[PDB]
Amino acid sequence: NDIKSKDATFASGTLDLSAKENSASVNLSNLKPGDKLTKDFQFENNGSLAIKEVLMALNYGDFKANGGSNTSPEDFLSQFEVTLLTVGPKNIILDDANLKDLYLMSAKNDAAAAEKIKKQIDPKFLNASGKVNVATIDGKTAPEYDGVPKTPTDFDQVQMEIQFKDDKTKDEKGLMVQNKYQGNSIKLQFSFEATQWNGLTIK
Ligand SMILES: O=C(O)c1ccccc1O
């Protein structure tokens, strides 16, 4: 989470499930179609709280055109897809999910957006709220197990990949259409909310 931390970091971020703050921010700047950004996350729970889910949501902001033709924040947002998986076999939760749809679902609980994500996602990972549960134990969500041992197991490692989708479409003038986004930038924040077994955010 630290501002001085290298943006091209190999280490998996450690998210503390006791929840001082729990976010991950990333700037989408100076990119071109086909570029990818990867990050691993590990959930730590050194007090062993009784955590049922870890609910992820997306927010965005600070769009800037920076001289590209596109001045729409959402159109730029819509050029990126996210893949989220858990390992500990790799359990795919989200596969190339459009970030604009992921935003409207997880931020707004927009039903039409949720329908687009529901094309691909296993509903086992969907919360009521429109947020995605990313906390698994061997690829199964905690509520699939028959209670919790005295000390709860560590949740599986999370791996995320954001890609700038590469259309390759040209227009009537022979120009690459996604060149409207040239120079554009935008900021994303992925939030992670641990919940109690009653579904409430941990206090
Ligand atoms: O820091 C990153 O590059 C990153 C990449 C994918 C998902 C979340 C992130 O913070």
List ligands, each type once. Answer: 2-hydroxybenzoic acid
Strand count, sense and barrel status of the largest sheet are: 5 strands, mixed
Helix fraction?
10-25%
Principal-axis shape: elongated
Number of helices: 3
β-strand number: 11
How many domains, as an integer? 1
Widest beta sheet: strand line-up: 1-3-10-5-6
- Structural class call reads mainly beta
**What's the oligomerization state?**
monomer
Report the order of strands and helices.
Answer: EEEEHEEHHEEEEE
The rounded distance between the terminal residues' Cα atoms is: 21 Å
User: Cα-atom Rg, whole angstroms?
Assistant: 18 Å
- Could you tell me the strand content as a percent range? 25-35%
Describe the protein's architecture and organization.
The chain has helices at residues 73-77, 99-108, 111-118, and strands at residues 13-16, 23-28, 36-44, 53-64, 80-86, 91-98, 132-133, 136-137, 140-141, 158-164, 185-195. The strands form three sheets. A five-stranded mixed sheet has the order 1-3-10-5-6. The longest helix has 10 residues, at 99-108. α2 packs across α3 (111-118). It has 203 residues and is mainly β. The protein has one domain. It binds 2-hydroxybenzoic acid. 2-hydroxybenzoic acid is lined by residues 24, 26, 37, 39, 160, 162, 190. It is classed as protein fibril. Keywords: TasA, amyloid fiber, xray structure, protein fibril. It forms a monomeric assembly.
